[PDB]
Amino acid sequence: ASRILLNNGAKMPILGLGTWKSPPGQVTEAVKVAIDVGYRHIDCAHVYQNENEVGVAIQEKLREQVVKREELFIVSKLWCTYHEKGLVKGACQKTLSDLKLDYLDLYLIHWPTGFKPGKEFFPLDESGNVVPSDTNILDTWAAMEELVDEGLVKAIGISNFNHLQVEMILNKPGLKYKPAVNQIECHPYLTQEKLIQYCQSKGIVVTAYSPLGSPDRPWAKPEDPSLLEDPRIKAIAAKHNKTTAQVLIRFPMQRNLVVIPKSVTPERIAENFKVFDFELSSQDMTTLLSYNRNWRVCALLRCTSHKDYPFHEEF
Ligand SMILES: NC(=O)c1ccc[n+]([C@@H]2O[C@H](COP(=O)([O-])OP(=O)(O)OC[C@H]3O[C@@H](n4cnc5c(N)ncnc54)[C@H](OP(=O)(O)O)[C@@H]3O)[C@@H](O)[C@H]2O)c1
Numbered sequence: 001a002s003r004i005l006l007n008n009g010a011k012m013p014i015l016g017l018g019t020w021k022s023p024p025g026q027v028t029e030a031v032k033v034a035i036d037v038g039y040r041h042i043d044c045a046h047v048y049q050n051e052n053e054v055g056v057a058i059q060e061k062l063r064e065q066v067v068k069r070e071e072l073f074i075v076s077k078l079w080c081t082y083h084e085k086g087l088v089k090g091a092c093q094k095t096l097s098d099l100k101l102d103y104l105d106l107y108l109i110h111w112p113t114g115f116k117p118g119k120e121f122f123p124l125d126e127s128g129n130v131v132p133s134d135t136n137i138l139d140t141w142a143a144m145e146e147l148v149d150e151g152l153v154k155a156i157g158i159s160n161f162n163h164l165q166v167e168m169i170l171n172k173p174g175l176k177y178k179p180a181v182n183q184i185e186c187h188p189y190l191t192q193e194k195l196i197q198y199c200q201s202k203g204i205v206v207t208a209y210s211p212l213g214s215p216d217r218p219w220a221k222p223e224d225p226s227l228l229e230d231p232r233i234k235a236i237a238a239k240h241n242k243t244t245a246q247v248l249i250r251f252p253m254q255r256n257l258v259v260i261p262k263s264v265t266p267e268r269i270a271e272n273f274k275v276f277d278f279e280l281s282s283q284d285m286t287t288l289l290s291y292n293r294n295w296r297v298c299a300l301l302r303c304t305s306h307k308d309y310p311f312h313e314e315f
């Protein structure tokens with residue numbers, strides 16, 4: 001089945017296209033080709049600074065009569081410098097304008113950490129520390145809830161929240177909307193069993209980001225582990241006559257996760273969608289889970305002193 005049921009009654013496609021690090025000069029074509037081969041979910045963010053170009057592709061294909069708006073599932077995220085309640089509507093409306101949409105299917109708090117408001121995405125002090133903002137998760141959640149009630153977004157959720165941070169929202173007195181989705185890093189080297197169990201048991205859908213290990217992340221070190229080149233995964237791939245990427249994408253799909261692999265390469269965009277024609281075996285699944293090393297692609301040393309840094313907790 002291609003889509004998963006959210007707590008708002010809407011269905012979310014389990015395979016989406018990632019757009020972090022998709023250069024504006026190349027992402028419009030990525031999204032066109034993705035829509036042509038069947039993607040209907042696109043994962044966006046204001047901080048990715050390509051939403052305009054994403055919007056361009058979507059409008060093009062709507063105009064070509066390739067897809068209908070109702071068939072698309074467009075996700076974006078509120079960046080860290082906009083957590084003040086007075087700033088949230090504006091941030092959401094900027095993304096909508098850039099994407100040339102009148103609603104988002106899903107709007108996420110990108111990180112639980114609020115940062116000093118201003119133009120800079122990562123404001124730092126003279127010593128390199130990210131400057132936090134005087135904001136908190138519940139007040140930010142409240143402002144996300146207003147976006148639903150105004151019709152700008154059909155569903156709201158969170159990203160990079162540990163289970164305790166999720167619980168704070170769940171336990172909020174006066175909660176209007178429960179989070180629909182928690183989008184977290186997840187792959188064979190960071191398998192997230194405790195947080196997936198927590199979220200799924202609370203009826204929160206989990207989206208796996210960086211499912212291929214984000215080899216293009218700008219802070220990569222050469223000695224880091226590399227999923228796509230892992231010989232053991234290559235071997236599981238060869239056995240199914242599939243590529244390593246294809247296995248890495250099928251893996252979260254079989255854990256009842258949503259997965260959002262990124263590419264700007266048209267052949268890989270098509271390749272990455274070809275994962276509904278095979279099944280990983282029970283052995284393949286537990287083998288892949290056993291490769292966990294609690295290794296994160298996405299974790300900022302210069303945020304570790306933030307009150308709301310999410311990765312001090314076990315999960
Ligand atoms: N919520 C957040 O905090 C958060 C954080 C990180 C990521 N995410 C989202 O998750 C999406 C995916 O994560 P990611 O961008 O970190 O990385 P990823 O999807 O794990 O990997 C992307 C890298 O893999 C390469 N690639 C793609 N398909 C391939 C294939 N079939 N064979 C070989 N190489 C392939 C891409 O190359 P080319 O593009 O050059 O083809 C790119 O360098 C992001 O784009 C973003 O939308 C969300």
Ligand SMILES: O=C(O)COc1cc(Cl)ccc1C(=O)NCc1cccc([N+](=O)[O-])c1
Nearest residue numbers: 020045047048111113298299300303309310
């Ligand atoms: O966040 C993403 O979606 C992908 O990561 C990006 C993307 C861009 Cl465009 C710029 C910077 C980042 C990155 O440093 N994100 C990691 C990060 C951020 C904030 C807090 C934390 N934290 O750990 O508190 C971590």
